């Protein structure tokens, strides 16, 4: 609906994707149809980005949440600096948080069980404040993203 561009819905999307990457799906009937569609598209993107940046990312030690946040913020600012917003770019946001959580898993100095919740949070912050208006104008997640990316 029109309110799926508010923080709570986006946070759940971001958390859902990291739980998928980390292989800890939470109990219940499963995620929303939005999350289910997003998870395949974002993971396909994640694998391609990991491949195309292997050398670059191997030279970055993501040793803390603060390092992950600062890097996320810098990459996002550069990615969106031309003012353009579209669904492909929004998908890459989810792919990048999956990359960060995988590097944190190998390099975080002080792991905490809630790390993926902290990452999901500042990811949702960025999506809402920097793309939320565009998302809403283009049908939101249910009437925009899912309609375009779900199977035909």
């Amino acid at each position: 609906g029109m309110t799926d561009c508010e923080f709570g819905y986006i946070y759940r999307l971001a958390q859902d994707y990291l739980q998928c990457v980390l292989q800890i799906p939470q109990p219940g009937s499963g995620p929303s149809k939005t999350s289910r569609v997003l998870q395949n598209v974002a993971f396909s993107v994640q694998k391609e980005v990991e491949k195309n940046l292997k050398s670059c990312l191997d030279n970055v030690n993501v040793v803390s949440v603060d390092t992950a946040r600062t890097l996320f913020n810098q990459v996002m600012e550069k990615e969106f600096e031309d003012g353009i917003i579209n669904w492909g770019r929004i998908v890459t946001i989810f792919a990048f948080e999956g990359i960060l959580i995988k590097k944190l898993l190998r390099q975080q100095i002080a792991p905490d069980v809630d790390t993926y919740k902290e990452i999901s949070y500042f990811v949702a912050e960025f999506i809402m404040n920097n793309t939320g208006e565009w998302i809403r104008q283009n049908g939101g997640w249910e009437n925009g993203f899912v309609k375009k990316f779900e199977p035909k």
Binding site: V41, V45, E48, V49, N52, L53, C56, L57, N59, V60, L71, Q74, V75, K78, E79, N86, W87, G88, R89, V91, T92, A95, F96, K148, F149
Partner: peptide, 22 residues
């Protein structure tokens, strides 16, 4: 900046996603 290299790949993959829908 090393950030630019990451962002460039992100921009490129994003537009491939948009075009690959068709």
């Amino acid at each position: 900046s090393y950030v630019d290299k990451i962002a460039d790949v992100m921009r490129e993959v994003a537009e491939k996603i948009n075009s690959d829908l068709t």
